Design an enzyme around this catalytic site. Structure first.
Site, short mmCIF file in Angstrom:
data_model
loop_
_atom_site.label_atom_id
_atom_site.label_comp_id
_atom_site.label_asym_id
_atom_site.label_seq_id
_atom_site.Cartn_x
_atom_site.Cartn_y
_atom_site.Cartn_z
N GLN A 1 0.82 -1.21 0.00
CA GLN A 1 0.00 0.00 0.00
C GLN A 1 0.85 1.25 0.00
OE1 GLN A 1 -2.26 -0.29 3.77
NE2 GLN A 1 -0.50 -1.42 4.58
N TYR B 1 -9.70 5.30 19.97
CA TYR B 1 -9.89 4.04 19.23
C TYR B 1 -9.10 2.87 19.84
CZ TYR B 1 -9.46 0.86 15.23
OH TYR B 1 -9.40 -0.24 14.40
N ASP C 1 0.47 -0.11 13.74
CA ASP C 1 1.04 0.98 14.52
C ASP C 1 1.46 0.54 15.94
OD1 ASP C 1 -1.54 1.52 16.27
OD2 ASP C 1 -2.20 1.59 14.18
N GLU D 1 0.21 -8.99 11.10
CA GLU D 1 0.15 -7.76 10.30
C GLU D 1 0.73 -8.06 8.92
OE1 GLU D 1 -0.56 -4.19 10.26
OE2 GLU D 1 0.36 -4.42 8.29
N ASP E 1 -1.02 -12.12 5.74
CA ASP E 1 -2.43 -11.83 5.62
C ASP E 1 -3.20 -12.51 6.77
OD1 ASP E 1 -5.17 -11.47 4.72
OD2 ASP E 1 -4.93 -13.33 3.56
N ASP F 1 -8.05 -4.97 13.97
CA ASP F 1 -7.80 -3.54 13.93
C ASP F 1 -7.38 -3.20 12.52
OD1 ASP F 1 -6.94 -0.91 14.06
OD2 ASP F 1 -5.14 -1.35 15.27
N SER F 2 -8.38 -2.96 11.67
CA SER F 2 -8.17 -2.79 10.24
C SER F 2 -8.51 -1.36 9.79
CB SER F 2 -9.04 -3.78 9.47
OG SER F 2 -10.43 -3.51 9.67
N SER F 3 -8.03 -0.99 8.60
CA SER F 3 -8.61 0.13 7.87
C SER F 3 -9.95 -0.33 7.26
CB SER F 3 -7.66 0.70 6.79
OG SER F 3 -8.20 1.89 6.17
N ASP F 4 -10.40 0.39 6.24
CA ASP F 4 -11.74 0.22 5.67
C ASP F 4 -11.84 -0.98 4.74
OD1 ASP F 4 -12.80 2.70 6.91
OD2 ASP F 4 -11.21 3.61 5.72
C1 LIG Z 1 -2.56 0.86 10.91
S1 LIG Z 1 -3.68 -0.36 11.57
C2 LIG Z 1 -4.43 -1.26 10.24
C3 LIG Z 1 -3.44 -2.28 9.69
O1 LIG Z 1 -4.14 -3.34 9.00
C4 LIG Z 1 -3.19 -3.89 8.09
N1 LIG Z 1 -3.84 -4.85 7.17
C5 LIG Z 1 -4.58 -4.58 6.07
N2 LIG Z 1 -5.04 -5.73 5.50
C6 LIG Z 1 -4.58 -6.75 6.25
C7 LIG Z 1 -4.68 -8.22 6.22
N3 LIG Z 1 -5.41 -8.84 5.23
N4 LIG Z 1 -4.06 -8.91 7.20
C8 LIG Z 1 -3.35 -8.32 8.19
N5 LIG Z 1 -3.19 -6.98 8.28
C9 LIG Z 1 -3.79 -6.17 7.35
C10 LIG Z 1 -2.60 -2.65 7.44
O2 LIG Z 1 -1.35 -2.98 6.81
C11 LIG Z 1 -2.46 -1.71 8.65
O3 LIG Z 1 -1.13 -1.73 9.18
#
Ligand SMILES: CSC[C@H]1O[C@@H](n2cnc3c(N)ncnc32)[C@H](O)[C@@H]1O
Ligand SMILES: CSC[C@H]1O[C@@H](n2cnc3c(N)ncnc32)[C@H](O)[C@@H]1O
Ligand SMILES: [Mg+2]
Ligand SMILES: [Mg+2]
Ligand SMILES: [Mg+2]
Lengths: 289, 297
Positions: free
Chosen positions: B44, B74, B99, B119, B150, B168-171
């Site tokens: 990313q 959060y 993070d 992560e 993953d 703890d993910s993004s969108d």
């Molecule tokens: C910053 S906190 C959100 C974290 O989720 C992570 N992330 C996104 N997709 C996946 C996934 N499929 N498995 C593990 N971590 C992920 C991103 O790299 C980011 O560091």
């Protein structure tokens, strides 16, 4: 001018280093009144938006949050609010919420700027419907001055202002709170826009401290609203009635009442929860150091 | 129906503006003091900058992940909502959390013996250690087992293994997309022990009520107890975000913490947002969302 490349951006030294922008569908109004700069536009995803001196006042999409809370926090904290004063509230939204209570027979509104009333009727019809209430007595003038001509007159006073800038500056002063004390009946309650715990915790504790020298009961509640700075705003609540418990509504609402009033934000559990602050804010306002 | 898109991270005239099709027609901008990092990883785009008023800011594919000024909201909630809803959480899994801030909060519970984190992106870990040291301090605990991979695939590897799982993910976009799917929730169910609980980033009730209701429906077919809670955080879209909470224990009551915290515990844990009253209130939704989520139509 505040609109560039199809977006309006809100900036203000009271929330430095951050901005909300809303994408613009159509400019509707832009003209300076005697008191302030008045901008109205149709946004892409928030409906119509009223902006005064570059500061977002309301959007059609999320206004109900602030409107229902500023009305119902004080009204549901009074066992029989009959006469209400609203200072500001030019869009008519607070008036619209206040008049839903059968106890309320008389609402006086004091708005400084008649051009705000006019553009609201035209572009904020779901809010300015408030102006068509048979319960309303409308005054055009400075609320700070109008407060002096009233003594022992009101069960509830609501100050629905923008920020402590421009024409609303004095509405955040200790002198103004004394005026409200005098304009309230002996057991009267007030609710004023009280700003954001994520931005102005200093102002909040300072207002709280001076209000405690005037009123037996002082409380801070907040609500969420996407288009206010930092996504929320608070309310200063004061009562001259030593028995007032703001945190537990003296007038709870049934689910049926909530349904009948068509409330989109407020209910009695939400009222209770609005006083439950983040630990940093709870500590700042309540704990000793 | 199309895939979600965010505006590519850019600094223009000293401001960073966050845009995304998951919240169309609105944007938060934060004024930049100093650009600190801007490079694409193998996964990313990573932007890190020192902001004028929010400390350091991590941005992944144009989306704000955290700021030093408000991260504690959060971080504390995503950690304590599930932990304080379990009578004795000993084994914790974190998916994402690059993070390190969630790790930092989880390890404050003496009951917690081991934390596994999976992560996907090794580069996020490194930029967080450099530019978010108050969060990335979480990485320096002896309780931690770290995997880089993953989390969806990692989930397949574990069965009856965790008391608590936190995503703890993004969108629902890019590498995180599968983390919002029913098949992922089934994998977590299997990875949890018999009375385990999970907490996932569950999006914003003022923006994503459709997704919130849909996730709720599919989780109710999987777990006896499903709930939604939110916290306020100025720098997520619309100023707040929520959490999906699920339990395999039919006795779990998420709104009433089974582990209340005393004021002393709150002081000892140095909490800046979470407390047991805040926990309870975080389930009290505005009428529109209570109705959408609870009333049958
Ligand atoms: C910053 S906190 C959100 C974290 O989720 C992570 N992330 C996104 N997709 C996946 C996934 N499929 N498995 C593990 N971590 C992920 C991103 O790299 C980011 O560091
Ligand atoms: C839109 S809600 C806020 C309203 O408060 C009004 N207002 C600002 N300052 C004052 C004042 N001193 N007295 C009465 N109304 C005011 C503004 O014109 C606006 O319509
Ligand atoms: Mg009822
Ligand atoms: Mg368990
Ligand atoms: Mg105690």
């Amino acid at each position: 001018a505040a609109i560039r490349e199809g977006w309006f951006r809100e900036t203000c030294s009271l929330w430095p280093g951050q901005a909300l922008s809303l994408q613009v569908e159509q400019l509707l109004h832009h003209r300076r009144s005697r008191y302030q700069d008045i901008l109205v536009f149709r946004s892409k995803t928030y409906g119509n938006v009223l902006v005064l001196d570059g500061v977002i006042q309301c959007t059609e999409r999320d206004e109900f949050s602030y409107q229902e809370m500023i009305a119902n926090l004080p009204l549901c904290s009074h066992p029989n609010p009959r006469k209400v004063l609203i200072i500001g509230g030019g869009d008519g939204g607070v008036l619209r919420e206040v008049v839903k209570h059968p106890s309320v027979e008389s609402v006086v509104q004091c708005e400084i700027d008649e051009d705000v009333i006019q553009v609201s009727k035209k572009f904020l019809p779901g809010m300015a419907i408030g102006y068509s209430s048979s319960k309303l007595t409308l005054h055009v003038g400075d609320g700070f001055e109008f407060m002096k001509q009233n003594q022992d007159a009101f069960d509830v006073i609501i100050t629905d202002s923008s920020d402590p800038m421009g024409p609303a500056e004095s509405l955040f002063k200790e002198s103004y709170y004394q005026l409200m004390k005098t304009a309230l009946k002996e057991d009267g309650v007030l609710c004023c826009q009280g700003e954001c715990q994520w931005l102005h915790l200093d102002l909040i504790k300072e207002m709280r401290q001076f209000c405690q020298s005037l009123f037996p009961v002082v409380a801070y509640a907040y609500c969420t609203i996407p288009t206010y700075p930092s996504g929320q705003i608070g309310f200063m609540l004061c009562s001259k009635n030593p028995s007032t418990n703001f945190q537990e509504p003296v007038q709870p609402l049934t689910q049926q009442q909530v349904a009948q009033m068509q409330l989109k934000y407020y209910n009695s559990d939400v009222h209770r929860a609005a006083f439950v602050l983040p630990e940093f804010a709870r500590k700042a306002l309540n704990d000793v150091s």
